[PDB]
Amino acid sequence: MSKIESALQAAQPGLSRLRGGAGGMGYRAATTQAEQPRSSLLDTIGRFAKAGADM
Amino acid sequence: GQNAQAKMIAAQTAAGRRQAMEIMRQTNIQNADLSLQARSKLEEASAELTSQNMQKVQAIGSIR
C-alpha cells in the first residue's frame, strides 16, 4: 500500500538515463561513394570502338 | 604516301586513347583524395564531438 520514498530523497537508480564519459562517437558511415556508372559505361563504349570499330 | 597517312592517324588513335586513359587516371585519383579528405573530416568531427562530450561531463555534473 505505502511507497518507499528514500529513492526519491536520492537519485533513484536505473530510471531514465545515466551518463559516463562516452566519447569518440564518430557519427555514421557514408552513403556509398561517388558512383561512376556513367563514366564506366562511356569508357566501355570507347574501348569497344577503339578495338573493333577502329580497324 | 598512304602508309605515312596511316601512321599519322594511328598516332591520333594513340594520342586520344592515352589522353582518355589519363583523363580517367587523373579523375579517379582526385576522387580518392576527396574520399580521404572526407574521412579526415569525419575524424575531426569525432574529435570535436568528444570534446563536447567531456565538457558535458563537467557541466551536467555541476547541475547534479
Subunit contact B42:A34, Cβ cutoff 8 A = no
A30: left (phi over 0), alpha (psi -120 to 50) or beta: beta
CA separation for the pair B21, B27 (Å, rounded): 10
Asked if residues A50 and B17 have their Cβ atoms less than 8 Å apart, the reply is: yes
* Contact residues, chain B, for A22 at CB < 8 Å: 53
In the numeric block, which cell numbers belong to residue B56? 558535458
> Residue B20 region, left (φ>0) first, then alpha (ψ -120 to 50), else beta?
alpha
* Entry resolution (Å): 3.2
The C-alpha atoms of residue B56 and residue A23 are separated, in whole angstroms, by 11
Beta-carbon separation of A25 and B53 below 8 A: yes
Query: Residue B13: which of A34, A46, A15 has the closest Cα?
Result: A46
Please check whether residue A46 touches B, CB under 8 A: yes
Method of determination is cryo-EM
